Design an enzyme around this catalytic site. Sequence first.
Site, short mmCIF file in Angstrom:
data_model
loop_
_atom_site.label_atom_id
_atom_site.label_comp_id
_atom_site.label_asym_id
_atom_site.label_seq_id
_atom_site.Cartn_x
_atom_site.Cartn_y
_atom_site.Cartn_z
N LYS A 180 0.81 -1.21 0.00
CA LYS A 180 0.00 0.00 0.00
C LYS A 180 0.84 1.27 0.00
O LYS A 180 0.32 2.35 -0.24
CB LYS A 180 -0.94 0.00 1.20
CG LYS A 180 -1.64 -1.34 1.37
CD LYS A 180 -3.06 -1.30 0.88
CE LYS A 180 -3.21 -1.25 -0.61
NZ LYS A 180 -4.65 -0.99 -0.99
N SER A 224 -2.41 -12.40 4.73
CA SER A 224 -3.00 -12.42 3.40
C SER A 224 -2.02 -12.97 2.37
O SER A 224 -2.43 -13.48 1.31
CB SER A 224 -3.47 -11.01 2.99
OG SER A 224 -2.37 -10.21 2.60
C1 0JO Z 1 -7.57 -2.15 2.12
C2 0JO Z 1 -6.32 -2.26 2.61
N1 0JO Z 1 -5.79 -3.57 2.60
C3 0JO Z 1 -5.02 -3.85 1.42
C4 0JO Z 1 -4.43 -5.30 1.54
C5 0JO Z 1 -4.56 -6.24 0.55
C6 0JO Z 1 -5.33 -6.00 -0.76
O1 0JO Z 1 -4.84 -5.15 -1.70
P1 0JO Z 1 -5.81 -4.39 -2.58
O2 0JO Z 1 -6.43 -3.40 -1.79
O3 0JO Z 1 -5.04 -3.83 -3.61
O4 0JO Z 1 -6.83 -5.21 -3.14
C7 0JO Z 1 -3.99 -7.50 0.73
N2 0JO Z 1 -3.29 -7.81 1.84
C8 0JO Z 1 -3.12 -6.87 2.78
C9 0JO Z 1 -2.39 -7.21 3.97
C10 0JO Z 1 -3.71 -5.62 2.63
O5 0JO Z 1 -3.50 -4.67 3.62
C11 0JO Z 1 -5.87 -1.28 3.68
O6 0JO Z 1 -4.75 -1.38 4.14
O7 0JO Z 1 -6.64 -0.42 4.08
#
Ligand code: 0JO
Lengths: 312, 312
Positions: B41, B271
Amino acid sequence: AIYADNSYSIGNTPLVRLKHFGHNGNVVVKIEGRNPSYSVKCRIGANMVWQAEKDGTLTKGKEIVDATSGNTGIALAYVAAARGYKITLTMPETMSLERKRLLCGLGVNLVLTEGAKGMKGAIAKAEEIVASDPSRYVMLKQFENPANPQIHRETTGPEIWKDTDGKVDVVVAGVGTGGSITGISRAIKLDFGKQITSVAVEPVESPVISQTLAGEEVKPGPHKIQGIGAGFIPKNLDLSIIDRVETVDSDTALATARRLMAEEGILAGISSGAAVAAADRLAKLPEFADKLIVVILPSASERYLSTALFEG
Amino acid sequence: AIYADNSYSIGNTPLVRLKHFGHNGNVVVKIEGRNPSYSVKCRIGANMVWQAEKDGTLTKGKEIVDATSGNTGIALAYVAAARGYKITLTMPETMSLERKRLLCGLGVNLVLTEGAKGMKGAIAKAEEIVASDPSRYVMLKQFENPANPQIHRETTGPEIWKDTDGKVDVVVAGVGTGGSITGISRAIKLDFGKQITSVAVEPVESPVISQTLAGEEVKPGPHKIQGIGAGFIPKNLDLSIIDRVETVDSDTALATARRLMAEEGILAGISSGAAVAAADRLAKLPEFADKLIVVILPSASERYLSTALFEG
Ligand SMILES: C=C(/N=C/c1c(COP(=O)(O)O)cnc(C)c1O)C(=O)O
Ligand SMILES: C=C(/N=C/c1c(COP(=O)(O)O)cnc(C)c1O)C(=O)O
């Protein structure tokens, strides 16, 4: 390219210019937190294993041993997992909870040693572990293993040279084993031939390099700058290439690391704060005002959540 | 080169071949933990801020707002610190303690929302925060802001293309906002013209993409795969470029992340375990047996020490 295992992906860490330290951008930091296991020691975890493989002291069935303040242990641990070795590590019980839990998660046989005895205690324990069964173990001994500074001479130093287009004038690094400042200094001074200022950083609480060079009695002491200030002159510190020693106190180290986070958006560990504070002092002397100062930031913030770094 | 601030140092993360997953090295992982604030991110934290600067919605004196499960918040936080903005973030109270403490260390106005309401709750809170004083705040809204997938189209996708020498056949990514899989897929399919398989990963506990595509009733649910499975179809998920959806359960996600650490020496977040488990299933189907599968690993282990990832 695609790396055959995580150990081959070491290095190529970025230089970032500081905005609230130094004088008009003359302080730039090398973010060693961006490594396979998120510290500068990823490089020596990889090369010490590779070198021991190459000279046949590490084989399948041999179990790795070393003493660490944490980061080298985590480095050897991911390499051991990646390349298929068992591993035992000693570490003072006083080191960050994050180090302990991550080592366990990586499958280490972790032996915690008495806090009062510091690294000397961890080193002592590792030696008696290996002596109990020399055929089972190989101690990689980061404090004297030449493969430690050598990888910094081959990678870290050249990266600095390339990314600064040969303009680096000063290198500032905290000293634990001494490998970083040693290998970097040899690369830039001897391989590229530029007469930079090499600056070792140590805690004012345990200024054994300063005392040594001054011909004063070496008097080590307790401090909170995890990873440096081991309380003795390590074999992998090439005193001969050190031009200057800077001392930094624990409070200022911690406050500087917090500033790096809050003011630069750089997630630095505690020793990173010490190194930048020393660099900031040099950077504001007119003699270094127009010189390019490169600072090693050995580790990242989240490895220190249980420490005074996140006090408050 | 030397980056003017930490935001410019995003990306250029390495590909590492897995040895204990996939079939003879057909599974390769992209380690997004190696970023300015140690997650994928970092890229959108940087680009959303840059884009808002460019179109004048973010100026000096304006305070950033968004809703996050943690990593985007940490990303926006380091960028805000680096570039001089105040910032407020909402986040479900159930997200990892590491996320909370790091956000605070970066100087965030952190608003924790009710765990039961998940991301929808955090999004709702961010909207009513901004509505209380529209001239003070700018919500960057990562779930629909096009600057999110665009930076993946410009950096993450091209990196994959270059590092695989155009041989990438499959991309596997968990979906939170959808930005990663969307931007990567657009780059490789539309900009380089290769008809790869784009694979979205979601929790079997909350398989709303699968249900949607099947014309079944969308039934979100609770799960432990922090960062994905937001319980709705996000605007930044381009359903049209998704060729396949794979579901993974929480237990297997966690066990796979532990395996990545213990068996590959890769310090993966939860994840990351889900994504590799989905990729491993595809990799062992003869139809993908000789195809190159690239897996996004969004984050690093130490951001999850307080979670079930380090159970035991
Ligand atoms: C929506 C978010 N999460 C992204 C994320 C993702 C998913 O990425 P995308 O938002 O690009 O789909 C996968 N794995 C982890 C640990 C993540 O933090 C956030 O950090 O707010
Ligand atoms: C001796 C180690 N400490 C290295 C270290 C250093 C010093 O690097 P050298 O060992 O290369 O001097 C600086 N900062 C941090 C956080 C460190 O972990 C070790 O991890 O065992």
